[PDB]
Design a binder for this molecule. Structure first.
Ligand SMILES: [Cl-]
Ligand SMILES: [Cl-]
Length: 341
């Protein structure tokens, strides 16, 4: 009896994907979920993960490769690798040279999710929902406190977003940028932030319990769809702000000590099927990395410029870089100050 252990982000697969794979292959899948790159990286660095497949963001995988925690993918066992978009492969290869270890799964941006009606009520019809000003100017966040604010519990993403907003290199190597301006601004915003969390904000936006969030694009579009299906009158939207935003590429990778390698390759080749992954995108509102799948994706998802953004918006996106120990120290120390402010 073959088994397969998979660790993926929460809210990142269609409801029937695993069952359909089990039915086709006779493999039993053990599926577990996380909402933090830090949790996954900690598990990878502390010992065996016990998983056959894990799904880091590519910028985290970039440094994880150098610790030897992954084994290279046997492309001879991934015949339809060909379906993957070559331009996305090239971007991911900046993190994973020659695409040896990582299979691109989904990608999106770190932007602003918000309740349309509540934000306009508080900040007026002309609320700047196209700008990080909406949530990174203290005067606006003090007012939005009235209906609830959440930030992601994602330190590398939040500091890069703040640095970009301040006109600094999103990947600044100047320690003073973190300890000075970035911390100063975050500590001014902190009293108005209800919580730091990277998954509770989906249902809280959908149900009207918060009105604005730093969020991952497809998560917010899921919240919007859950609100529509509830017929609760909640109108949620998402913005890639005008100052730019961070892009991420989530990738499947195989732990070096994976027990069930043959089954893992079966699952990866299953995900490379254009109809399988288009069906996932249809349900999670994330762009997949599979060029053959794009026309199969629902018009609702494929034509949303907050999911598949056009070239002029993609040109404004930035990605995370590896930092040295000093910046890791000052960034992490500053993050701890902010979450307890
Ligand atoms: Cl099962
Ligand atoms: Cl929840």
């Amino acid at each position: 009896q073959k088994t397969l252990h998979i660790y993926n982000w929460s809210d990142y697969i269609a409801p029937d994907t695993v069952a359909n794979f089990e039915k086709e292959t006779g493999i039993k899948v053990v599926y577990d979920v996380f909402d933090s790159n830090e949790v996954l990286e900690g598990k990878l660095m502390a010992g065996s993960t016990g998983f056959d497949l894990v799904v880091p963001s590519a910028s985290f995988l970039e440094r994880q490769l150098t610790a030897g925690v992954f084994q290279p993918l046997d492309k001879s066992k991934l015949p339809e690798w060909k379906n993957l978009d070559p331009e996305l492969l090239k971007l991911v290869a900046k993190h994973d040279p020659d695409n040896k270890f990582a299979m691109p799964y989904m990608w999106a941006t770190t932007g602003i999710g918000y309740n349309v009606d509540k934000v306009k009520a508080v900040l007026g019809e002309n609320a700047p929902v196209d700008s990080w000003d909406l949530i990174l100017k203290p005067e606006n966040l003090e007012k939005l406190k009235s209906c609830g604010v959440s930030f992601l519990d994602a330190p590398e993403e939040v500091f890069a977003t703040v640095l970009n907003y301040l006109g600094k290199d999103p990947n600044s190597t100047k320690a003073d940028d973190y300890t000075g301006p970035a911390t100063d601004l975050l500590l001014k915003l902190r009293p108005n932030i209800r919580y730091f969390h990277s998954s509770q904000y989906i249902n809280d936006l959908a149900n009207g319990d918060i009105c604005v969030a730093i969020g991952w694009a497809g998560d917010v579009w899921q919240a919007s769809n859950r609100a529509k299906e509830a017929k609760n009158g909640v109108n949620v939207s998402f913005s890639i702000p005008k100052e730019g935003a961070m892009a991420f590429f989530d990738v499947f990778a195989m732990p070096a000590d994976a027990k069930n390698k043959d089954e893992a390759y079966q699952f990866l080749n299953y995900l490379l099927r254009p109809d399988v992954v288009a069906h996932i995108s249809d349900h999670v509102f994330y762009a997949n990395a599979n060029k053959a799948a794009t026309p199969l994706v629902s018009a609702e998802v494929r034509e949303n410029p907050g999911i598949y953004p056009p070239a002029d918006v993609r040109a404004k996106l930035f990605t995370l870089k590896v930092q040295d120990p000093k910046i890791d120290r000052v960034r992490t120390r500053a993050w701890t100050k902010v979450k307890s402010g």
